[PDB]
């Protein structure tokens, strides 16, 4: 087996050349050039209203592109469609399985999707002019648990999995249009580009890797973390993204500069991150910890821009509206409180 | 204001009808005690008019460290084990024991020698089968007594109709949680 090992040695010498290219672009840091800027200061957000009515732990949330409606999962098997302004439960959908890991809302504003531990991505319909809410189709193509769903449109929807495969689904047929491989872990979360062309997904392998949807190939793989990556969120311009981790660190990576820009961590923090998200401009990084609070970070100076400690029990998924008007945090205590 | 009042008059009935539906469903939800077994999958059934919603993990991969944190609302973690299956089962029982979230969740064990030199060093408190199964039983007790968590305790069983045995054991779990809720135990 000499040729296999020497071919792995050539793979090692040019990946060493890859590391040499990474040092080649490493001329400065983010903190040095962003040293001469004025931070936001202590910024205060208080709970404007709380949404009550879940019977068990809320595992997910997804906003709407109209910024009005928000969809929340739960442990009990009820995905409840909420109105944020008038705090009224607009819809309530009984799920087929009890455990659901994620929910999505259509950018058209016409469909919702549950993704659960039952290995099924199920799509529900809202625009039924006859009557109530139904199942349009359920999707079945993994041998592992579902972790996070996102929509491209009303017709093709992208799902990650714990079957090590991000996949692209089409609703008209119920089959995988393409299947993304290259990971070696549970694919935890994924976020689309703002022009919806490409998406990046975290994993178990401490490795968040960009994916091209047409090509179905591992474009580039960012490895700077220490344990499994829990949730990532894409930067609003389309050129960077920030990753949560398990070593209490947030890292923002650049797609073009191909390496770490900053590390958001304190030694006093030893708790794993559950979800991160950017604001509208991208200045603020809203990171929800297991210390039952979400810290607010400046994107450019790596300080606690604010501390947001409303919740009783830990968070599951926080989100920012598309206009940037309000931030809502789900939690494990059956109550999600919108913030502003 | 006719659009605003018609919108609110829509949400009046929609909120009251949906919150009323949830109020009806919540009493049914609390009436279910969920059990997780490791060792289509979901099964809910009746024992003495008690609803048990049970989940099988056979449709998952070997990696376990991030779908088991979804189960911190379960009442009991069943282990169906057998005979090197044993030592990795002791690894797994220790791994779920010392977990930061699952310190409150109890565990029920079921069973349904050349790796151990301690096997011959055992004293019994087929006799070879008897000394073997009580050696394994005490061996599992070694992790619980070694940790000393105090909130959850391992409940071993055997075979040679398990559902009445796990119902009565679950009754013990409910009594200990409800009793210690009054800061008594």
């Amino acid at each position, epitope marked *: 087996q000499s040729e296999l090992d020497q071919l792995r040695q050539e793979a090692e010498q040019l990946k060493n050349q890859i590391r040499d290219a990474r040092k080649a672009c490493a001329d400065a840091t983010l903190s040095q050039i962003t040293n001469n800027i004025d931070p936001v200061g202590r910024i205060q957000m208080r709970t404007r209203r709380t949404l009550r009515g879940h019977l068990a732990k809320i595992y997910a949330m997804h906003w709407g592109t109209d910024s009005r409606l928000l969809v929340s999962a739960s442990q009990d098997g009820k995905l409840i469609i909420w109105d944020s302004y008038t705090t009224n439960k607009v819809h309530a959908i009984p799920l087929r399985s009890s455990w659901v890991m994620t929910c999505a809302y259509a950018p058209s504003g016409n469909y919702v999707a549950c993704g659960g531990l039952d290995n099924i991505c199920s799509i529900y319909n809202l625009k039924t002019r006859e009557g109530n809410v139904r199942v349009s189709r359920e999707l079945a193509g993994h041998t592992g648990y579902l972790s996070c769903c996102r929509f491209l449109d009303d017709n093709q929807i992208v799902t990650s999995s714990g079957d090590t495969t991000c996949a692209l689904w089409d609703i008209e047929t119920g089959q995988q249009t393409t299947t993304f491989t290259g990971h*070696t872990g549970d694919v935890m979360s994924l976020s689309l580009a703002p022009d919806t062309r490409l998406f990046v997904s975290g994993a178990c392998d401490a490795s968040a890797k960009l994916w091209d949807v047409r090509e179905g190939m591992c474009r580039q793989t960012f490895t700077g973390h220490e344990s499994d990556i829990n949730a990532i969120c894409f930067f609003p311009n389309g050129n960077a993204f920030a990753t949560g981790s398990d070593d209490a660190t947030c890292r923002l990576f650049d797609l073009r500069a191909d390496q770490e820009l900053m590390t958001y961590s304190h030694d006093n923090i*030893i708790c794993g991150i559950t979800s991160v998200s950017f604001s509208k401009s991208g200045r603020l990084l809203l990171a929800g910890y297991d210390d039952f609070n979400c810290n607010v970070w400046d994107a450019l100076k790596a300080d606690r821009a604010g501390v947001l400690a409303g919740h009783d029990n830990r968070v599951s998924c926080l989100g920012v509206t598309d206009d940037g008007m309000a931030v809502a945090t789900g939690s494990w205590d059956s109550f999600l409180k919108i913030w502003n | 204001t006719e659009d605003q009042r018609n919108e609110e008059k829509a949400q009046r009935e929609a909120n009251k009808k949906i919150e009323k539906q949830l109020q009806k469903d919540k009493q049914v939800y609390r009436a279910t005690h969920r059990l997780l077994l490791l060792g289509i999958f979901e099964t809910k059934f009746q024992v003495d008019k008690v609803n048990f919603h049970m989940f099988d993990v056979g449709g998952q991969r070997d990696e376990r460290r991030k779908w088991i944190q979804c189960f911190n609302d379960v009442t009991a973690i069943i282990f169906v084990v057998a005979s090197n299956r044993l030592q990795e089962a002791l690894n797994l029982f220790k791994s779920i024991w010392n*977990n930061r979230w699952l310190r409150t969740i109890s565990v029920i064990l079921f069973l349904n020698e050349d790796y*151990f030199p301690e096997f011959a060093r055992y004293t019994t408190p087929d006799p070879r089968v008897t000394r073997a199964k009580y050696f394994i039983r005490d061996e599992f007790l070694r992790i619980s007594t070694a940790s000393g968590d105090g909130r959850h305790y391992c409940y071993p069983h055997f075979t040679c109709e398990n559902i009445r045995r796990v119902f009565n054991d679950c009754r013990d779990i409910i009594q200990r949680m409800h009793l210690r809720q009054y800061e008594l135990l």
Partner: nanobody
Amino acid sequence: QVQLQESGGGLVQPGGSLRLSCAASGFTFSNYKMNWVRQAPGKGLEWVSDISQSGASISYTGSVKGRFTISRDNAKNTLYLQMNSLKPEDTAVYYCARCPAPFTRDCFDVTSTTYAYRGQGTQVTVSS
């Protein structure tokens, strides 16, 4: 990038003794928990032995009890295993494995497939 590389291994006689040295690279080694796992010939992965974060608390498999010993050096950023009166059945691929969580007491790393945080495995083989 968390890459684990382990030197040592090779051929040992029955009754021989040998040292396996695992080097840890790309992570803050002082925080985590280490363990060694075997791949038996034509069998699944089997857990052997672990250490605490300080190195004070060590567990073993029953078969490796009294004969094998493991110790970490955080300054040397490494883990060692030493054999004492080795047994000819032990012909195995030994992997140096990291527990996934910082500041923890539990590990989930006996999985045969697709666990990331492990080495490549010194083909520790015993002669006749």
